[PDB]
């Protein structure tokens, strides 16, 4: 319709720059802006320039930054991408990622990188949101946009690089029972500081460094003592009836050569159902993630139907349409962890979260390891009333820029609901 | 002049609002526009609630975030300052800062809160900013703002709080001899990578976690053992001609009645300055800071004579201006370490530089222990053309959101100066 047109939507510039994120490592930011004046500014967070089957990011491998730069990502949105969509609709963005997928060629955009490709696709929603004047969350989820998520807060680590000897990988507390992201948010930081103490306390003063994502790192070795700890931390914090549990396993790490090693014993998938099965019996562990190896969709199947929790696909789905397609003939899991830098756009990105809500799945909008002061997931999360969002402990600027985005969307919206305990369907 | 007055840069709204730092513990974010349409938001640093010298931050002291919470700053803001500056010229920061100042009536802002205070202040001056179309450091610093600064990285850390055995506070790299702003944050990146290496092979995969500025805390009992590790780390990078080092002794911390406890030592001061004389022989050492307790001028002003390095007054003078002159009057330090938050309002903040400038100090624009997403400090520098800033290791967003700032502004100056080996004074 001729009375859509608008000038004042046109790309008037787009530039891309080489910034470093949360660990030290190059990444993109890019900048977009339209002839009305509308602004957008994106930053992707690190990802894999490797994978089977990912979107994979575009990476210098010289020899400055450890051969992590992104110098040809950069250019490539400079000199390939931007000439393509310079006076371009910001508004299209469908066809906008489009042009940026053929430009690209291959299947999982690692000629141009799905680092370029992201940014872009980010920078140019957040300018075109910004000349419709409209919220971000609104203009990316439409009029009702307006579900805050329950966090799940990685607030103790483990796997082999966390420090400690547990097997599991994350070990997470969820307040589905604040009325808020507010309370939310303060009930995580609460149970974070008494956890800290309780640390602090027992193991010494050496023992409260944080890692990657912000959680600390007790020396222990079983997933009760890990288990345990965070429920004295809850219950001291005055929190136990309205925080849970979520475990993200990242079974994987701990799998070889047909068995999984846990706890110093060599388990094979039943066995590691049932010792997942007594964990859920003992704890108010309401969500787990990646319980088997990457391939195993039979395994999630299995543990997806026996057990009456969540069962979130990570490393099984890699955020891959078809992936996740198997998954839902094969009912393997029932939830999606969504990295939107594991896909590479934003039209893609959503059409991977609505094929999981469609098909009675949950999607957990991720964080990245490697994260930024960009804060897109926030807003993502709300645009698609996820319900969950998996973003950090209370600690770190790249996780709490996140938490406070998620506290000024709540605040905005004059009306606003927390999904709480309906975390997985908040309708 | 008629033609100055423009009804665009009064203040049209301002909200405060309770969000967190990085550390978990909430902090106040001050959101200004101007009928111009000019926006400014801004969030401020962790301080102190409690001092005889410094402005004070208010809390709460309720059961929330353990006490910690800011909501009577908030509401100071948004129900007793507001009112009074609503309507007013937004480039008008002197009148605007000494209204709250008048307002709060107190010699340390502890009636509203110098977190109260300090939001609005630096709110607002982005807002001008935003409504005259003039970059932030160009407005804050005038037309001749564009020397980048060079990055003092806290990577390994000491004290009490550390972990470890190290007396001193802050073990720092300065990469003087890189020739960019953009290259001075890689080569701290690189060096910093191999640093956690080195540890990782040294002490283990449980030795690497991170401190609340985003360095590591090896298990080390010297400062030479500290200044080793630099050293190798350095050199394994490749940087020997390029980095040199900078310390945070933080004295105050370990003195007690008359002595210093180092090392297993009872010093008296001018063994302490002996031992500080020693390391910067056998070490590329070219800054110091608060090599003695926070009143000792007198010692200040012996080490400061006595060695050829940058001294720098941080507790000693808590950026206050009383303080710095009987310094400067004293010739104790030759260096202020610049914590806006400290004293309240950017003119008070800029009036102190100032005043170190014009007697031959340095100034080293810092953050705090608690920082968040905010990258004032990082224009800020560069508006004041300090040669030198303090902002944390290459590592957490509420750090690298500096360094990414930094970044951007050197790009989007086109012509711009690195202090490099001329921190000190970059004309």
Known sequence: MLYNMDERFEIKDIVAREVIDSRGNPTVEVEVITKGNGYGSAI??????????????????????????????????????????????????????????????????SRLGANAILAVSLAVAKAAAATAKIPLYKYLGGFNSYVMP????????????????????????????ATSISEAVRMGSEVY???????????????????????????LKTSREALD????SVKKAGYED???????????????????????????????????KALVDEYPIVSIEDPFHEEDFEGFAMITKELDIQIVGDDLFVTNVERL????????????????????TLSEAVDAAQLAFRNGYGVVVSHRSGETE??????????????????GAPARGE????????????????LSKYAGRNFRCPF
Chains 1, 2 share one sequence.
């Open 44 to 109: 992707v967070p690190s990802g894999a320039s490797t994978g089977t089957h990912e979107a994979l990011e575009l990476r210098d491998k010289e020899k400055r930054f450890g051969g992590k730069g992104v110098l040809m990502a950069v250019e490539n949105v400079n000199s390939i991408i931007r000439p393509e969509i310079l006076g371009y609709d910001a508004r299209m963005q469908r066809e906008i990622d489009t042009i940026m997928i053929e430009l690209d060629g291959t299947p999982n955009k």
């Open 150 to 177: 329950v966090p799940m807060m990685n607030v103790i680590n483990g796997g082999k690089h966390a420090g400690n000897d547990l097997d599991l990988q994350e070990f997470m507390i969820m307040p589905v029972g």
């Open 193 to 219: 500081h008494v956890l800290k103490n309780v640390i602090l306390e027992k193991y010494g003063k050496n023992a409260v460094n944080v890692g990657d994502e912000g959680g600390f790192a007790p020396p």
């Open 229 to 232: 700890l965070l429920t004295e």
């Open 242 to 276: 309205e925080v849970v549990f979520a475990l993200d396993a990242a079974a994987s790490e701990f799998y070889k050569d047909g068995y999984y090693y846990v706890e110093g014993k060599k388990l094979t998938r039943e066995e590691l159902l049932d010792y997942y």
């Open 325 to 344: 397609r198997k998954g839902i003939e094969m009912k393997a899991a029932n939830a999606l962890l969504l990295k939107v830098n594991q896909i590479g």
């Open 374 to 391: 960009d804060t897109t997931i926030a807003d993502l999360s709300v645009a698609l009333n996820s319900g969950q969002i998996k973003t």
């Open 399 to 414: 996780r709490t820029a996140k938490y406070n985005q998620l506290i000024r969307i709540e605040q905005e919206l004059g």
